[PDB]
Amino acid sequence: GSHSMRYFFTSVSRPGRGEPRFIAVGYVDDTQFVRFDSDAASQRMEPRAPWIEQEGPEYWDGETRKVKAHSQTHRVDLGTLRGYYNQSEAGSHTVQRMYGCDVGSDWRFLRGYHQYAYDGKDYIALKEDLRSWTAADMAAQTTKHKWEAAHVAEQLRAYLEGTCVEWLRRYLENGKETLQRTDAPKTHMTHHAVSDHEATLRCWALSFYPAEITLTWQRDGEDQTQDTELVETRPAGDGTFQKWAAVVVPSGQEQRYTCHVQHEGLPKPLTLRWE
Amino acid sequence: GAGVSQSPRYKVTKRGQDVALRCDPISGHVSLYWYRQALGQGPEFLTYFNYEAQQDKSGLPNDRFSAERPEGSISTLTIQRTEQRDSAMYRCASSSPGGVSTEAFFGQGTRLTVVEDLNKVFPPEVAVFEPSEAEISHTQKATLVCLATGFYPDHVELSWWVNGKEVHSGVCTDPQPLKEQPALNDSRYALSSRLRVSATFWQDPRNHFRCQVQFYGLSENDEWTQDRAKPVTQIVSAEAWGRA
Amino acid sequence: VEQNSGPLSVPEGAIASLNCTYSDRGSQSFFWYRQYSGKSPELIMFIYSNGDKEDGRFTAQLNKASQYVSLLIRDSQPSDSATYLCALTRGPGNQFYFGTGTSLTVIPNIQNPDPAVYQLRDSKSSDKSVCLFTDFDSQTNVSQSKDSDVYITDKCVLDMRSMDFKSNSAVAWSNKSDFACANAFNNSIIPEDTFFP
């Protein structure tokens, strides 16, 4: 159904140890496709997916020029933000940036966004209308007054609606076998006795895509989402994801409990039980 | 600095030698563009930089042309093995102070002239022609005429000086010079100018008129084997006092 | 960025119209530059919003649907005589494009014509001489096809700012000849009542 393209940028100062470290990465949905690293030997935007490699020399030269311009801009932003917040030269600080666009089932423009962060907290963010900003504090309003004067929102809105979507559409067609696939989760349950009284029932879900998944537990019909040990949806390493949810149960009452699983690739949601 | 500053302003070069055109942009300007402008045409795009990195090289006419901007400020366009067809007005420009979009601020430019033989370079012979008898009686005004002749290439800046101070009021200078021998390709040039004042101002012997002509020819490092004087960058003047 | 074909000639005090089209519909910022003879281009106006933008006598107009820009010089003086350049950029960090340029020449209104061909002596040597054809209205224009030895320049509009008095002048001389100063400008159609002393 819905899809998205997003670029993530990180810039970290290393005072008296060369230039700031700059890492940029591009995603389509939950599949990474490009990267750039300022410490790497190549000094180029490199491919991190099979389907992007078919792009000619003009694409890669163009992306290298643009990502180099990002790198050098966020280098200045570090110096600017240090002066804004009145911090010492020797201290290390972080600048994070994210932008991109979403699309619906029809591949039309759903929404866009463009956000900044300094030392973990939110700095400045483009609102959903793409014509106005949200300033976190004193310093963010200084940047807001500059960017309202420079008509930056009008420039970003044109990209996010126009260009961002056209490239997202084009990547989805290029990597049809990778991006538009939908791998179903391979589920199974496992039993482990904690004590004479207690017993744990873990409900797995392996090798699925995309990462959006729901694993809830029920005690004979009704939900009991409290006392359910969830974990982060973690990457397997080969493109697919993993997740599990565990519950503590009295010994000899395992078949009362059931694990409900919901996923895009699943036509109907699976209901698991202990053997 | 305050504005964009290129160097050199004018440059003569022997055919086959290399040249380096300098461009010092405005402080903090991210973008820096290069252009060449042929006679009676708009600025043709060559190349540009964002911060340090040269962007698209496609606009550079061939592999003899090259450009850098190593420390992210001063750029340097470099033409190797120059040819006569490389001769143009090379302008640079900067924009975008702190990344925000602005106009392109232009430099003064570099007049590059690639000459086949350095012996064809000549400085101008200047001469001031005094106002007519009939003009003062008929129109009650006096027109001086200056005439810089026999110079090559077209590297000249004419100016009038009344009592040791430059004047722009009442002055007219030609937009282009004339070929002394139009048939030839390497022909010398000739430029005219007119300074018009009142009859009373000319007739006063106190006033001192002067036609100054700055010429740009060869530099100090250019070799010179011929017997006549080295045709270097120089001011050639000519003067005429008042009379009644 | 294709610009209108020069040159262009406009009377003094009249509305001059300059136009320019462009292919790239994604261009954000548009500019009008002015380049005097042997000078660098200087900015007149910038525009990005559609419709008109007035700045004194100059009025720019952008139509991004029909994708053209235009400059309208109202009550044009002789000092407006320049090559007007249109310029645009896709945005900050991108290339900065220029049109080919239109060569405007505002024809000065000489309200008191008094045509005359005067002779002038060189202060260095008496032998050297030059003929000044001056104070003629803008309907007249010169020509140089006389001889190999004889040279004749084009028109030159001088402007006496104190006295408020325009004057089109022209210069003509020979290197070595029995040069007729009366019959120097006999190539071009000079006025019928020209003063020969």
Partner: peptide
Amino acid sequence: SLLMWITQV
């Protein structure tokens, strides 16, 4: 594809 960006904070 990245947007061309030089605009500073």
